[PDB]
Amino acid sequence: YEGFETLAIHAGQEADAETGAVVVPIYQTSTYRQDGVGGLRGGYEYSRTANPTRTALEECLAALEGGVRGLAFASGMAAEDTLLRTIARPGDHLIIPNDAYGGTFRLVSKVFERWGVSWDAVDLSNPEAVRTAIRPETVAIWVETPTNPLLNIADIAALADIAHAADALLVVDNTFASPYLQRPLSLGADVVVHSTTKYLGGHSDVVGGALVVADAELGERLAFHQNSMGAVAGPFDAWLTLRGIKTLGVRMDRHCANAERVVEALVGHPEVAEVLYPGLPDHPGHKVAVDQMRAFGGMVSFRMRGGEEAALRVCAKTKVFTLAESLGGVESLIEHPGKMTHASTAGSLLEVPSDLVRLSVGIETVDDLVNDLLQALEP
Amino acid sequence: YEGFETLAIHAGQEADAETGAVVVPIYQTSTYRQDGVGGLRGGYEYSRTANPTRTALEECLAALEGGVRGLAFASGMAAEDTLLRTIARPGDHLIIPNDAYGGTFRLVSKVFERWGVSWDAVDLSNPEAVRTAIRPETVAIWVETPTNPLLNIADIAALADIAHAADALLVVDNTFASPYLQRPLSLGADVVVHSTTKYLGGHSDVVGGALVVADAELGERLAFHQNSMGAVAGPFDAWLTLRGIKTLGVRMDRHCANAERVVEALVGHPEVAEVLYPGLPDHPGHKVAVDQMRAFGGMVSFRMRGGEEAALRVCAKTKVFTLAESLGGVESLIEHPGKMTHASTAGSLLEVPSDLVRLSVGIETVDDLVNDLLQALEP
Amino acid sequence: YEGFETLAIHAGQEADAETGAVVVPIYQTSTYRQDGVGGLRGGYEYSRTANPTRTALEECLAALEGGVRGLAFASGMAAEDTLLRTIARPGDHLIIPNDAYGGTFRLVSKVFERWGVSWDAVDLSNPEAVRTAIRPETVAIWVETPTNPLLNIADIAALADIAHAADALLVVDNTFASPYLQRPLSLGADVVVHSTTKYLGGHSDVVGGALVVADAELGERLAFHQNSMGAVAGPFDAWLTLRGIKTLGVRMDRHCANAERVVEALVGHPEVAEVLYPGLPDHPGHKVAVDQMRAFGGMVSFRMRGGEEAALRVCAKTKVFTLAESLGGVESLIEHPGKMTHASTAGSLLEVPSDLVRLSVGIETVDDLVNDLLQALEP
Amino acid sequence: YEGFETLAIHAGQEADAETGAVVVPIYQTSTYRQDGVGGLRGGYEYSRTANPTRTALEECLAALEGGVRGLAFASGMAAEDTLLRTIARPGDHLIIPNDAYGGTFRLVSKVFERWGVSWDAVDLSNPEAVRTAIRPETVAIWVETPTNPLLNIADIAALADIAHAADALLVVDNTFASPYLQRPLSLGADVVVHSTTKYLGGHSDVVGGALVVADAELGERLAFHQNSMGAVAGPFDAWLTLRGIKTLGVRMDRHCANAERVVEALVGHPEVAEVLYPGLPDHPGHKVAVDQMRAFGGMVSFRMRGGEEAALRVCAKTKVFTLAESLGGVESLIEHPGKMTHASTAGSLLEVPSDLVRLSVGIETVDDLVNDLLQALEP
Numbered sequence A, B, C, D: 001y002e003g004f005e006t007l008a009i010h011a012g013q014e015a016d017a018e019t020g021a022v023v024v025p026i027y028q029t030s031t032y033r034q035d036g037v038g039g040l041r042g043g044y045e046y047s048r049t050a051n052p053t054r055t056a057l058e059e060c061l062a063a064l065e066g067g068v069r070g071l072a073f074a075s076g077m078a079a080e081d082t083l084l085r086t087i088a089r090p091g092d093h094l095i096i097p098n099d100a101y102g103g104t105f106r107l108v109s110k111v112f113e114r115w116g117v118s119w120d121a122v123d124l125s126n127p128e129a130v131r132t133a134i135r136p137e138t139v140a141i142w143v144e145t146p147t148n149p150l151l152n153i154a155d156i157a158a159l160a161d162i163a164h165a166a167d168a169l170l171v172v173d174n175t176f177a178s179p180y181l182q183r184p185l186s187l188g189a190d191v192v193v194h195s196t197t198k199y200l201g202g203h204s205d206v207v208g209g210a211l212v213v214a215d216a217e218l219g220e221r222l223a224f225h226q227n228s229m230g231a232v233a234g235p236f237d238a239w240l241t242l243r244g245i246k247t248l249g250v251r252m253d254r255h256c257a258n259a260e261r262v263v264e265a266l267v268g269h270p271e272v273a274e275v276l277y278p279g280l281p282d283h284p285g286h287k288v289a290v291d292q293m294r295a296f297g298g299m300v301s302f303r304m305r306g307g308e309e310a311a312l313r314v315c316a317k318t319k320v321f322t323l324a325e326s327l328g329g330v331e332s333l334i335e336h337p338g339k340m341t342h343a344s345t346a347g348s349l350l351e352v353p354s355d356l357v358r359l360s361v362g363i364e365t366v367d368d369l370v371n372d373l374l375q376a377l378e379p
C-alpha cells in the first residue's frame, strides 16, 4: 500500500540493473541488438515500438492512475488522436463536452467528422442530457472535469454507469486535475487521457501526452496504434515528463493553496463579475468536486464586468503571471481563451465568453501573485 | 546557387539574433509569452503548433529537397499517418508498392482500410501496371525507390505523369536514398516522406519523420494536421536530426563507397545466390537508378543458397555488423526482413523471401566490414 | 520585494526576447557569431567564457543567495577548486571544519597541501578555537553548517566577524541547508559554495557546483579562473539544475516535514544510540540553528547501539531508502559515511564514527519512509 | 587490427547488456545503488568519480590515440588544468611553445606562475632550442603541432627523446590534428591533450576536453585529480562528443580536401602576403608534417598585404565563413587571432601578427567557400 508520492518517484523506476544508476537512463537510441534473429534483449527491438525510458514513464503513469497499462505520446493531442483512431471507425458517434479544450473540439469536428465520426456536445454536468444523447452508434463519452476553461464538474462514477449501460467507453481527460487530485479509473472510467505538457511535466518545458487504461486488451489495441501510427513521446521528453512527475504532489499542494488565496482576492473585487473555481461552495458541481477530487486545482477563471475590453487589458497588464497559452507549470500563466486557446471554438456550442480570463496559478510566493493580479485589475 | 553540403549546415540555421549562437538553441519550452493577446513574438505561440528548433529542421529539409515547406514528426510512421489523414478520406483508394517497409503496409492495410480507404499493391517498376491500377477514387500513388528491402527502382518522373494525369498525388518515400542522392520534387513528386530515423539523423539515436512539399497549400493542409493531431518531433529530437543532417553528404559518400566494396565481396561468393544493389548493371531498373540517383546507396540485400536456415545463421554470426532493425546509421546493421522488419508483410503481396538478408553498410573501415561478412558467410 | 519562490522561477529567466519562449533555451553551442571583430552580440563570444543558459542559472543563484554574482561549475568539487585556486597561493593557510564532506578534506589535504597551502581542522561550533586557529597566513575560514555528516552547527555571523577581524574571507558551503533555509551572505559570509548536485538540482540527475559572492571584484577574480581553468557547468546540466531550483521551496518544505517525522521514529528506538538533527532541542547548536535557519533540513544521522555491524545491516536492509552516495534528491538515500562518502577522512581529525548511518530523507509518502526504517532497524 | 573508423564507432560502445540499445545511454544520474555497503554495481558509485556515458567516451578516445586510459573534462582548458595540477608543483618548470592557444598561455602565465611554476616559451620547431631550455626543475615539454594559429610543426618523436633524456614528460596538444591525422603516443608522447570542443565533437555544440595516456600509473594520478578537483565532462556533453567522434574520419577527409582548395585560392591572390598551411612544400616543417600527419588539416592562416586594417575587413565581409572564436566544426569559421583568441598573448613572446586571419575550413561545398573568400578579399 505505497503512497502516491512514493509511487511517483519509484514506480517503473527501479535502479538500473547493470550500473545501479538511481535515475532511469535516457535511451537515446533507435534500435537494439538481438541475440540471433528474434532474440530480444529485455524485450526491446525498436524505439517506436518500445523504448526503456518511455516504458518507465508509461509504468509510472499506470501506477499513479491505478491502471494496467500506460502509453506515452508526442503530445496530448496525439494521445487523443491515437485513442480515437483505435476505438472509433466511420459511422460511429462520440459525445463530447459542451466546454472543452479547443484542440479536442478541433480534432473531433475538423478531422474525425471528415473521417465519418458523428458527434454531439452535451452538458456533462447534466446526466439526463448525457443519457438522452446516447445513440445506437455511440462508442464513447468524452469527459473533461474540471472543464477547460469554465471548470465545470462531471460526476465520473455517474457517467461511467451511463456509458457502460450503452456498451460505450468512458474517456476522462484528467489533465487539469492530475492523478494526484482525481483518479477516474477508480470511479469506472475506461481510459484516462492526459496532456503531460501540463501538471505532470510541470515546468512548461515538454509537450507530451499519455493514455492509461484499466483493461489490458484495450491497452494492447492502443499499443498497436502507438506502434503503427508512431505518435510516440521521444525518450528525452519522456524523461523530463517523468522528472516532473516526481514533484507533482508538492507542486499541486502549493498550486491549490495559491489558487485558494487568488480566489479570495478575486471574489468581491469590484471589476470582477464572476469567479469560477470548483472549491467555491456555490460553484456549479461543488459537491461532486468534493466527493471525487482531493482538492480543487490550480486553475481559476473569472469574468470582467467591463467585457472583452477589460479582460484583454488585464491579460496585458500582469508582470508575474505570463500571458501565454498552456497551464500547469510552476510559473503562473494568464490567457484570454476566446482569442487564444479557444479561438478554435468560436461559433460552436463550445464558444467561451469574451469577458473571461483563465489563470494557471503557479507556485510563486502567493503575495506576489495576489499583488500582481490586483494591479492588473485596477482600471 | 549554394551547394547541398552548404545548405545542410546553413539553411534554416542563421546564427541566433540575440546572442550570435552559431548552433540553433534547443527550445525546450511548451509556450511563449505574447505582447498583449495575439501579440506573437517571432510568430510563436505553442510548441505543438510551431517550435523554433523544429522550424530550423523543417526549413533545412525543405531546402535540401527543394520544396516550399517541411514538417517534422514524431517518427517516419507519424509523418505517413499525418499525410494520409490529410489527403485521404473514407471511399478513397491508394496505390502502394509491392515491396515496401512493413510498417507502411501495416498502417495502410490494418488502420486506413478499417477507416474506409481501399488499396492495391502494384509493381511500381512497371508503369503499365501503375497506369491500369488507377481507379476513379485513387487519391495518391505511394512510391518507395529503392524499395525496402529488395531495392527495386521506380521511375519517379514517369509515375508523376501517370499520377497527375489521374488528378492524383505522387508521394515518394525518399528514406533510403536521402535528399543527397535523389530529389523527388525535382522529378514531379508532390510529397516527399522520410523516416529521419535513418540516414538524415544518421546515428541510430533519434526516431523521427518528415514531409516536404512543393505546393504551399498542401503544406498548410498538412500543417493543420501536424498541429491538430499533434504527432510532432520534439525539439531535442529535431535538434539531433538537424545535427545529423550536417554530415549527410560525407556519410553517404562513404556509405556508397563501402556498399560498392561489400557488393564486390558478395557477388560470386559460393554461399550467395543473388545480390540486390541498384549499382549492379543487371539489377532490375539499374538505368533508371543511374538517371535519378547521384549514387546507389548504402543498402545491400542478398539471398543465401542454403535458404532461411543459412540466412538466419549469417545474421547471428556477424561481429561488426549489428543484428537489429533499422538502417542508415554510421554503424553497420544486418537483419532478416522475413522475421524482423517485414514480419508484418507475411502472407501478403509484400511478403519477402525467407532466404534474404538485408545490410545497412555503415561507415566503418571497409576491410573490417568485408572480413566480418566473409567469416559470417563461411558455412 | 519579490519572494523566494518567485525569484527561483523568474530571476535570470525573463521570457526569450525573439520568440517569447517562457523557459530559457538550452544553448548547446560552443561559439557565437560577432558583428565585425569584437562586435559581440549580447556580450557572448565563447561558451567556456559565458553561455546564456549558464548565465540564467548564475543570475538565479545570485538572486536566491542575495549576492552580486553567481558562477556555475562542473561539480561542487570544481567550484571548491576554482575558489581555492583564486583566493590562495603557496604559503597561505586555511581553517577547515573538523567535520566536513570527505571530498573537501581530500582536495585541501591531498591537492592544495602539495601546492603549498597549510591547513588546520577546527571545531567551528567553538568560536574560541576558530579565533585562536587564525595565523598571520590565514586567507579563509571554510564553514559547513550543518556539517556533513554529523549536522553540527556554526554561527555564521560570529565566524564572519572573526574572519574579517583577521582580513580573511568567510566561505560557507551552504549545500545541506540550501538558500531556501539559510542565506550566509546576509550574515557576513564573503562566498557561498554549493554542490548543486544536492538540493538545488534536487533529482539526483545532474552533478554541478556554484559560487555566489557579495563583492563584485572577488566575483571578477573568480570569473577569470572559471574562464581560464574552464571547469564550467555545461548548458544542459545548468538547465536541469535551474529546472530543479524552481521546486526547491516545495521540495525542502516536504524534506523538513518528512525528516521531523523520521527523527520522531528514531528517537527512543531501542536499537538507536543517538539521533543527530539540528531541530532536536538538545542537539549541539540547536539555538544557533533556530536563529540562522528557516527550518532544520532533510538530513538525519544516527548511531546504532550494535556498532559498525548494526549500521552496515541497516544500510543493506532499506527497500525505499536507496543505499548510495549523495543527498538532496526527491528520492530517499541512506549511506554509511565511514566506508562511503567519508572513507577519505579515515585516520584524520575528520574520521566519522563507524556506527553512524546518514539519511537523506526524500519527499516520498512519510509513512512509507518510517515503515521502511522501522523494518530495517529490527535486528 | 580494427581500423580507425571502426574503432571510432565501436570502441567503448558495445550494445547495452540489458536492452541491446545500440547507442550508449545518457546516464543522467548523480549516483548509483550499491548492493550492501561497497557492493558496487558494474564498478559505479558517483558520477564525478565515474559515469558510464563518460567511460564510453574515455575508452573510445583511448582506443583512437592508442593509449591505456582516457579522461574526459568540462573543457579543453580543464583537461590542461587537471594535467598540470597533477604533474607539477611549486618550484617546477615547464617549456611551452612560442605559438600556442592564448588560453594555454594564460593558464600557465597567469595561474600556474602565481602558484610557483616557472616557464619558458621556446621554438619547438628548433630541437636545439628545446634541448637547451631544459632546466633541472623541468617536469614537462608542452607541444602543440600544428601550432595555433601559425600552424608551425614540431617533430614529436625528436622532442620525446629530448624530454625523456631529461626525465621530463612530453605533452602533445593534438587538438588541431585529431587522432585521425596524428597519434602522438605512437611517437613517444606521454600525454595527449584535446579540446574535444574542436574536431572530435565536430559540430560547434559541446565544450569539452580530454587527456589520453600511455602509462596506467600516470592515468591513475590524473584520475585522482579528475575525481578530487571534479572538472568532469557531464554525461550529455560526453554523449554528444562521442556522437561527433563517429564521423571524425569522413569529416576530416573533407576538411583536408576543402582546405587544400582554399590554399590554392589564397596562394598568389594579390591581397594575400603569405599563406600558412602544413601541406605547402615551402611551409616551415613541411617534411616533418609529411612523416607524422596522415594529411595536413582543416586550418589555414594567412597574412593580408594591407595590414591589420585589411585583415579586420576580410573577417567582417565573409557570408559563409562565420566570424567567431573556435574551430573544427562542420561549419566554416574565420577570426582575427590578434583581437580574438590570442588577445591574451598580446605583449608576450606568443603575440600573433596583427595582419593575420585564421580559417577553420568547414565541410560546406568547396566552391561556396572559395567564392566567399574571394569576395571578402576583394578591396
Ligand SMILES: C/C=C(/N=C/c1c(COP(=O)(O)O)cnc(C)c1O)C(=O)O
Pocket (backbone or CB within 6 Å): A075, A076, A077, A078, A101, A103, A104, A144, A148, A173, A175, A176, A194, A195, A196, A197, A207, A208, A209, A325, A326, A327, A341, B046, B048, B230
Ligand atoms: C495550448 C494547450 C492547452 N491545452 C491543451 C490540452 C490538451 C492538448 O494537449 P497538448 O497541447 O497536445 O499537449 C488536451 N486536453 C486538455 C484538457 C488540454 O487543455 C491550453 O489550454 O492552454
Ligand SMILES: C/C=C(/N=C/c1c(COP(=O)(O)O)cnc(C)c1O)C(=O)O
Pocket (backbone or CB within 6 Å): A046, A048, A230, B075, B076, B077, B078, B101, B103, B104, B144, B148, B173, B175, B176, B194, B195, B196, B197, B207, B208, B209, B325, B326, B327, B341
Ligand atoms: C524498423 C524501421 C525500419 N524502417 C522504417 C521505415 C519507415 C518508418 O520510419 P520510423 O521507423 O517510423 O521512423 C518509413 N519508410 C521506410 C522506407 C522505412 O524503412 C527498417 O526497415 O528497419
Ligand SMILES: C/C=C(/N=C/c1c(COP(=O)(O)O)cnc(C)c1O)C(=O)O
Pocket (backbone or CB within 6 Å): C075, C076, C077, C078, C101, C103, C104, C144, C148, C173, C175, C176, C194, C195, C196, C197, C207, C208, C209, C325, C326, C327, C341, D046, D048, D230
Ligand atoms: C558524493 C557526494 C556527497 N557530497 C558532496 C559535497 C560536495 C561536493 O559536491 P560534488 O559531489 O562535487 O557535486 C561539496 N560540499 C558538500 C557539503 C558535499 O556534501 C555526499 O556527501 O554524498
Ligand SMILES: C/C=C(/N=C/c1c(COP(=O)(O)O)cnc(C)c1O)C(=O)O
Pocket (backbone or CB within 6 Å): C046, C048, C230, D075, D076, D077, D078, D101, D103, D104, D144, D148, D173, D175, D176, D194, D195, D196, D197, D207, D208, D209, D325, D326, D327, D341
Ligand atoms: C576559443 C577556443 C579556441 N581554442 C581552444 C583550444 C584549447 C582550449 O579548449 P577549450 O576551449 O577549453 O575546450 C586547447 N588547446 C588548443 C590547441 C586550443 O585551440 C580557439 O582557438 O578558437
Ligand SMILES: [Mg+2]
Pocket (backbone or CB within 6 Å): A014, A015, A016, A017, A052
Ligand atoms: Mg532499468
Ligand SMILES: [Mg+2]
Pocket (backbone or CB within 6 Å): A014, A015, A016, A017
Ligand atoms: Mg530495471
Ligand SMILES: [Mg+2]
Pocket (backbone or CB within 6 Å): A347
Ligand atoms: Mg460570433
Ligand SMILES: [Mg+2]
Pocket (backbone or CB within 6 Å): B014, B015, B016, B017, B052
Ligand atoms: Mg534563431
Ligand SMILES: [Mg+2]
Pocket (backbone or CB within 6 Å): B014, B015, B016, B017
Ligand atoms: Mg534567426
Ligand SMILES: [Mg+2]
Pocket (backbone or CB within 6 Å): B347
Ligand atoms: Mg506462408
Ligand SMILES: [Mg+2]
Pocket (backbone or CB within 6 Å): C014, C015, C016, C017, C052
Ligand atoms: Mg534570454
Ligand SMILES: [Mg+2]
Pocket (backbone or CB within 6 Å): C014, C015, C016, C017
Ligand atoms: Mg532575455
Ligand SMILES: [Mg+2]
Pocket (backbone or CB within 6 Å): C347
Ligand atoms: Mg583507524
Ligand SMILES: [Mg+2]
Pocket (backbone or CB within 6 Å): D014, D015, D016, D017, D052
Ligand atoms: Mg553499457
Ligand SMILES: [Mg+2]
Pocket (backbone or CB within 6 Å): D014, D015, D016, D017
Ligand atoms: Mg556494455
Ligand SMILES: [Mg+2]
Pocket (backbone or CB within 6 Å): D347
Ligand atoms: Mg604592442
